[PDB]
């Protein structure tokens, strides 16, 4: 997942005394949909995407069509 | 009085028996399917040392063979399989005539018409579909279909009119008439998903069952809910008798053979009672089918055996 869900950059910046190293690492958030850019599953703990429906009211009858 | 004796038991499978059928043209054949991904055609000797030997073994599937049915001539045989395809066999050496291409998921149920020109299929696609014998799609049903998996479809014997049964896991039984492909009716009933349905040889009835394990009776043409019977824990397969008005219900530890006129249980078939514990001490019975003689019936179990019985007076 490190290849998809993060980007990482490095830039050197000078000053009058030596060099300072900057590094920035940022994590991409998309999981529901789109662009689609990074893939929809979650990275580190890969979650079970769970919809819900649950009803019954059934009783016996014949309904002609 | 008409009662049952344990006839014998067949052997020759590595996978659970899924279905059995028999052609009345040759009652000396019998056909079987299984989760060893092969359908076995038998050679029945009536010796009680055995009760039959496998003649040939038809091969070529990459997943289970769910249901199987014979031709009306007994010279062809057809299969429905969880690899999403069907095959049309030539039951003389092997050599498939045709394989039917097009489903995205399993083909659970399948049946073969009386005129040998219409072949249907139930799928986990949530589509009933019709198939020419040339192996192309006459029609596809995707409107007013089940909202869950299609459990079993049937061709109905009738005076001449086209009627086909359909039942799914959405706890409904839909009857369809061809050449408009409409809902003839919707029957509501049974708590829990439907496993099976079967039609009377006369054809005016639909004996249905499922997870509920209750046997409700419906009228094909009247469209009325006759009654309900307590059929035990679960009923996976049903089959009317050809020469009686009985109904034979396949429950886990036993098969319950019911006389219909009057409504009562004749006997309960018990197999070997060998000591085992605890979740399914005997194997569940899952399929069953009568012979055309009506003396003998057969059963499918999950121990890879087909147990035989015979009626004795």
In a domain, B26, yes or no: yes
Burial of B90 (0-12, 13-18, 19+ CB in 10 A): middle
In a domain, B238, yes or no: yes
Please tell me the distance in Å from B190's CA to the nearest CA on chain A. 8
CA distance B163 to B113: 11
User: Cα–chain-centroid distance for residue B192?
Assistant: 20
Please tell me the distance in Å from B145's CA to the nearest CA on chain A. 14
Task: Yes or no: say if B209 and B200 are a contact pair by the CB < 8 Å rule.
Answer: no
Task: Provide the token pair at B277.
Answer: 């514990």
CA distance B141 to B127: 6
User: Cα–chain-centroid distance for residue B287?
Assistant: 7
Angle at B192 between CA B230 and CA B228, to 5 degrees: 25
Angle at B304 between CA B112 and CA B124, to 5 degrees: 45
In a domain, B91, yes or no: yes
| A4 phi/psi in degrees, rounded to 5 | -90, -60
Task: Provide the token pair at A5.
Answer: 């869900």
User: Which of B280, B282, B278 lies closest to B270, judged by CA?
Assistant: B282
In a domain, B218, yes or no: yes
Interface residues of A toward B, Cβ cutoff 8 Å, are 56, 58-65
**Sequence-separated (6 or more) residues with CB below 8 Å from residue B74:** B23, B25, B26, B29, B91
Q: Could you tell me the CA-to-CA distances from B250 to A48, B13, B104, B258 in Å, in that order?
A: 36, 20, 30, 11
In a domain, B2, yes or no: no
Burial of A31 (0-12, 13-18, 19+ CB in 10 A): middle
* CATH number for the domain that contains residue B259: 2.130.10.10
CA distance A41 to B262: 59
User: What is the number of other CB atoms lying within 10 angstroms of the CB of residue B110?
Assistant: 25
End-to-end C-alpha distance for chain B, whole angstroms:
5
Expressed as residue numbers, the domain containing B21 is 7-313
In a domain, B14, yes or no: yes
- DSSP 3-state of B123: strand
Nearest CA in chain A to B228: A60
Q: What experiment produced this structure?
A: cryo-EM
In a domain, B161, yes or no: yes
Nearest CA in chain A to B217: A60
Contact state of A58 with B189 under an 8 Å Cβ cutoff = yes
Tally of structural domains, chain B: 1
- DSSP 3-state of B75: coil
């Amino acid at each position: 997942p490190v290849n998809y869900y993060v980007d990482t950059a490095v830039r050197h910046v000078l000053l009058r005394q030596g060099v300072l190293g900057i590094k920035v690492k940022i994590m991409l958030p998309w999981d529901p949909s789109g662009k689609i850019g990074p893939k929809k599953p979650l990275p580190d703990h890969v979650s079970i995407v769970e919809p819900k429906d649950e009803i019954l009211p059934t009783t016996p009858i014949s309904e002609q069509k | 009085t008409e009662q049952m004796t344990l006839r014998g038991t067949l052997k020759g499978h590595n996978g659970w028996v899924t279905q059995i059928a028999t052609t009345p043209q040759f009652p000396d054949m019998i056909l079987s399917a299984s989760r060893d991904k092969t359908i076995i055609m038998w050679k029945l000797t009536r010796d009680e040392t055995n009760y039959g030997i496998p003649q040939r073994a038809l091969r070529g599937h990459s997943h289970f063979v769910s249901d199987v049915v014979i031709s009306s001539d007994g010279q062809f045989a057809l299969s429905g399989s969880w690899d999403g395809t069907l095959r049309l066999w030539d039951l003389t050496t092997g050599t498939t005539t045709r394989r039917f291409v097009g489903h995205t998921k399993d083909v659970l149920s399948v049946a073969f018409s009386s005129d040998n020109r219409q072949i249907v299929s139930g799928s986990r696609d949530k589509t009933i579909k019709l198939w020419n014998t040339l192996g192309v799609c006459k029609y596809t049903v995707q409107d007013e279909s089940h909202s869950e998996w299609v459990s079993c479809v049937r061709f109905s014997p009738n005076s001449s009119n086209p009627i086909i049964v359909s039942c799914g896991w959405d706890k409904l039984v839909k009857v369809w008439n061809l050449a408009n492909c409409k809902l003839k009716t919707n029957h509501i009933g049974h708590t829990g998903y439907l496993n099976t349905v079967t039609v009377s040889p006369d054809g005016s009835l639909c004996a249905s069952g499922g997870k509920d394990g209750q046997a409700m009776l419906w009228d094909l043409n009247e469209g009325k809910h006759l009654y309900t019977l307590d059929g035990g824990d679960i009923i996976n397969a049903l089959c009317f008798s050809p020469n009686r008005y009985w109904l034979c219900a396949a429950t886990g530890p036993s098969i319950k053979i019911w006389d219909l006129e009057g409504k009562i249980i004749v006997d309960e078939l018990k197999q070997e009672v060998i000591s085992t514990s605890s979740k399914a001490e005997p194997p569940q019975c899952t399929s069953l089918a009568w012979s055309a003689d009506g003396q003998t019936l057969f059963a499918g179990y999950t121990d890879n055996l087909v147990r035989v019985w015979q009626v004795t007076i």
